[PDB]
Ligand binder design. Structure first.
Ligand SMILES: [Zn+2]
Ligand SMILES: [Zn+2]
Ligand SMILES: [Zn+2]
Lengths: 105, 193, 48, 78
């Protein structure tokens, strides 16, 4: 959205002769240059995106209720890892408290 | 009990006794017999035909879509969204790879940017070329550009659909729809193809 | 257990029309059914 | 040891031929005429049998194993 400089209100976007013009309730009118060429957007599979589980994946090595697995961590050589299974495709991620995380992330 | 196969406590008897229409059926099914008796003997032939008849709408192949107020000219540098300004690199390749698919002269100020779900394209076995033909055969009032079909992870496949001016000339006498309204109506038609 | 091992290595590829979760659940339900051999120890412990 | 090695090989072949049962490596679904696909070299009597004619199982798999590997890795990410 575009915020009015004068009154900091949400300006109304209309389209005139091949240009996006924002007009406010206080009469201030501005035209967006490049960053306002986004009428609408949607994101699918929001329930299994990587940005969904960033906090959870970060906290997984410290949560005591997560399933562990007997595998060596290649960074700290700890002999156990934390195994999580996220998404409808059952993506398996192995995480450790040292910062190691399978899938290279 | 799951959606589409709900045969839990009384539902199907209620669908029969109440004469509920087909739109209200939670467990509708159908049995199809192959035309050739020789084909029905072989399981693989019946297996590929079964996967042939399965509604894969264009929406479910999309991870995210963006509606942009942009027009495309091959020579003139029109304004482009800054987060998607890198798309021009594969636009030049498309123009030199299709000497017959040149941009029209009546492209409107409306762009739909599509980022295909490459995982769904693999599991459902749907090629990029098949999607392009299906959309161009159903929507003659649009101009469609696409990136290269890549086999390397990390680089997505981008579908770009440009609305022509005739998309609004369909019915603009009904002035109770701004050009933003028709464009939103068009993208709903594209996704449900 | 070996179905889980296939899941860990990413060796479970679901067919067309099934997600990996739904195919994994289908495999587990099939693999956790008593065979017809279960009555062999049962019938050996009883006198009909 | 023999049991587990043979099981590994057989399970790998079974997974490969269950993935490419109707899915075609050349894109889309299989186009079957004269009992053979036209896009690839798949035969009908190989999808469910890997023992009677092992050589024809060790050739088709040797043709698209790589492409199979990249697709398997791609599905198991993000
Ligand atoms: Zn204002
Ligand atoms: Zn570690
Ligand atoms: Zn084929």
């Amino acid at each position: 959205m575009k915020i009015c400089k004068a009154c900091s209100s949400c300006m109304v976007r209309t389209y005139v002769d091949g240009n996006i013009i924002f007009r406010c309730s206080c009469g201030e009118s501005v035209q967006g240059d490049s960053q306002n060429l986004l009428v609408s957007s949607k994101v699918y599979h929001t329930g299994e995106m990587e940005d969904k589980y960033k906090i959870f994946i970060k906290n997984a090595p410290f949560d005591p209720t997560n399933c562990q697995i007997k595998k060596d961590c290649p960074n700290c050589h700890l002999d156990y890892l934390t195994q999580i299974c996220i998404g409808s495709q059952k993506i398996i991620i192995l995480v450790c408290r040292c910062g190691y995380m399978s899938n290279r992330g | 009990v799951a959606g589409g196969t709900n045969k839990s406590g009384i539902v199907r008897p209620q669908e029969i006794f109440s004469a509920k229409p087909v739109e209200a059926e939670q467990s509708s099914e159908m049995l199809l017999r192959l035309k050739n008796p020789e084909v029905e003997t072989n399981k693989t032939y019946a297996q590929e035909i079964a996967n042939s008849i399965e509604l894969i709408t264009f929406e479910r192949l999309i991870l995210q879509w963006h509606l942009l107020y942009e027009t495309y000219s091959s020579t003139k540098k029109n304004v482009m969204y800054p987060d998607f300004a890198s798309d021009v690199e594969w636009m030049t390749d498309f123009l030199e790879n299709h000497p017959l698919l040149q941009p029209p002269e009546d492209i409107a100020n409306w762009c739909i940017r599509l980022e295909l779900n490459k995982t769904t394209m693999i599991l459902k076995s749907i090629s990029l070329e098949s999607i392009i033909n299906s959309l161009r055969a159903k929507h003659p009032n649009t101009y469609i550009m696409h990136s290269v079909e890549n086999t390397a992870s990390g680089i997505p496949i981008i579908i770009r659909i440009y609305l022509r001016e005739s998309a609004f000339r369909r019915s603009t006498n009904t002035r109770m729809a701004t050009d933003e309204k028709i464009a939103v109506n068009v993208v709903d038609k594209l996704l449900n193809s | 257990e070996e179905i889980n091992n296939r899941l860990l290595h990413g060796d479970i590829m679901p067919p067309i029309g099934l997600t990996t979760h739904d195919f994994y659940e289908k495999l587990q339900l099939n693999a956790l059914k008593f065979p017809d051999r279960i009555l062999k120890p049962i019938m050996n412990s009883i006198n009909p | 040891k023999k049991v587990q090695t043979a099981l590994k090989a057989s399970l790998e072949f079974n997974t490969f031929y269950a993935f490419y049962e109707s899915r075609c490596p050349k894109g889309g679904l299989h186009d079957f005429q004269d009992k053979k696909c036209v896009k690839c070299g798949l035969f009908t009597y190989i999808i469910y049998d890997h023992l009677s004619q092992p050589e024809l199982v060790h050739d088709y798999y040797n043709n698209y194993k790589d492409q199979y590997d990249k697709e398997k890795m791609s599905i198991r990410s993000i």
